[PDB]
Design a protein around this motif. Structure first.
Motif, PDB file in Angstrom:
ATOM      1  N   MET A  28       0.126  75.557-134.155  1.00 38.09           N
ATOM      2  CA  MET A  28       1.180  76.280-134.849  1.00 38.09           C
ATOM      3  C   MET A  28       1.767  75.241-135.821  1.00 38.09           C
ATOM      4  N   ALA A  49       8.801  77.510-131.017  1.00 39.60           N
ATOM      5  CA  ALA A  49       7.423  77.989-130.892  1.00 39.60           C
ATOM      6  C   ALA A  49       6.823  77.463-129.581  1.00 39.60           C
ATOM      7  N   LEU A  65       8.194  79.475-126.621  1.00 37.88           N
ATOM      8  CA  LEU A  65       7.680  80.828-126.604  1.00 37.88           C
ATOM      9  C   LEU A  65       6.214  80.902-126.190  1.00 37.88           C
ATOM     10  N   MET A  66       5.401  79.940-126.560  1.00 34.79           N
ATOM     11  CA  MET A  66       4.006  79.821-126.206  1.00 34.79           C
ATOM     12  C   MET A  66       3.913  79.551-124.705  1.00 34.79           C
ATOM     13  N   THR A 115       3.813  84.620-127.285  1.00 34.62           N
ATOM     14  CA  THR A 115       3.051  84.521-128.522  1.00 34.62           C
ATOM     15  C   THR A 115       2.040  83.398-128.389  1.00 34.62           C
ATOM     16  N   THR A 116       1.268  83.172-129.421  1.00 39.23           N
ATOM     17  CA  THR A 116       0.231  82.168-129.563  1.00 39.23           C
ATOM     18  C   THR A 116       0.438  81.348-130.847  1.00 39.23           C
ATOM     19  N   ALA A 169       2.743  82.758-133.745  1.00 44.24           N
ATOM     20  CA  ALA A 169       4.098  82.317-133.399  1.00 44.24           C
ATOM     21  C   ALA A 169       5.068  82.453-134.560  1.00 44.24           C
ATOM     22  N   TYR A 190       5.987  86.117-134.961  1.00 39.73           N
ATOM     23  CA  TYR A 190       6.711  86.545-133.776  1.00 39.73           C
ATOM     24  C   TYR A 190       8.158  86.043-133.889  1.00 39.73           C
TER      25      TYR A 190
END
Ligand SMILES: [Ca+2]
Ligand SMILES: [Ca+2]
Length: 279
Positions: free
Chosen positions: A154, A234, A237-238, A243-244, A248, A251
């Motif tokens: 990301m 990020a 959240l990953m 998300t990925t 990300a 998202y």
């Protein structure tokens, strides 16, 4: 979990309104994910890192942060007290010298380095790359940013501090990566922040308290301080599995606080990074 009397940027990211001082986050805190900080290096020995930070590559004579900028950015990503993702793994790539300057060819090499290097690391929740640096438009710099993003990292980059359209600045103008603008504690666009249609999101960037070299702390401002808030978000959240790396940024934009910022020029998104934490 809650961090009482947190730095304003941390409280802001887990709040729907400005002015709060507690940072609420999920206890997982980014463990399992990895964040590469591509800057002046990181003072890995700083106690705020708890042994979770390590230098992995330098392009100069030494791998130490003789500037402080990179240590500052790394702290916002994942230091204990000033970090967004408190349990993440930090890896330093020194592409900037101790004066905070570096050449395009060395910055490009640093990005290719991370794309390859993430394959020898254990980062089960994902890999993030934080780039609080930039310069005049360069298609090769933009292209290196796009290769890193496509390799499965990301990538978050600073919009720039010229109070101008980010389209003439690089890595910033690369539409596939996540271009971050800065905001202040009153929900105003930071006066130095670049803007424009290439920006994807805004993060706290005015008077950000974080780690500094010599085992200290310091408050500084810039789109460079906003970038790590979203790289750190990020990573959080990953590891949460929301998300990925590939989506990300989108998202984050989809779940942001919308319409809260003031001084956003027509055509620039009015989206503020938000963790959406509910206890
Ligand atoms: Ca609101
Ligand atoms: Ca983008």
């Amino acid at each position: 979990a809650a961090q009482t009397n947190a730095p304003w940027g941390l409280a802001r990211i887990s709040s729907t309104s400005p002015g709060t001082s507690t940072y609420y986050y999920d206890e997982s805190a980014g463990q399992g994910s990895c964040v590469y900080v591509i800057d002046t290096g990181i003072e890995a020995s700083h106690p705020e890192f708890e042994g979770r930070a390590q230098m992995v590559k330098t392009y100069y004579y030494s791998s130490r942060d003789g500037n402080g900028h990179g240590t500052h950015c790394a702290g916002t990503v994942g230091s204990r007290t000033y970090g967004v993702a408190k349990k993440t793994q930090l890896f330093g790539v020194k592409v900037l010298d101790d004066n905070g300057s570096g050449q395009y060819s060395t910055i490009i090499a640093g990005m290719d380095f991370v794309a390859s290097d993430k394959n020898n690391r254990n980062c089960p929740k994902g890999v993030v790359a934080s780039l609080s640096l930039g310069g005049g438009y360069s298609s090769s710099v933009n292209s290196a940013a796009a290769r890193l993003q496509s390799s499965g990292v990301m990538v978050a980059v600073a919009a720039g501090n010229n109070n101008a359209d980010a389209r003439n600045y690089s890595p910033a103008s690369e539409p596939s990566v996540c271009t971050v603008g800065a905001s202040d504690r009153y929900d105003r666009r930071s006066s130095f922040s670049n803007y424009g249609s290439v920006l994807d999101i805004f993060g706290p960037g005015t008077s950000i308290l974080s780690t500094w070299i010599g085992g200290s702390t310091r408050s500084i401002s810039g789109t460079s301080m906003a970038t790590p808030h979203v790289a750190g978000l990020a990573a959080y959240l990953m590891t949460l599995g929301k998300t990925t790396a590939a989506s990300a940024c989108r998202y984050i934009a989809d779940t942001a606080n919308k319409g809260d910022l003031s001084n956003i020029p027509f055509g620039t998104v009015n989206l503020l990074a938000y963790n959406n934490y509910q206890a």
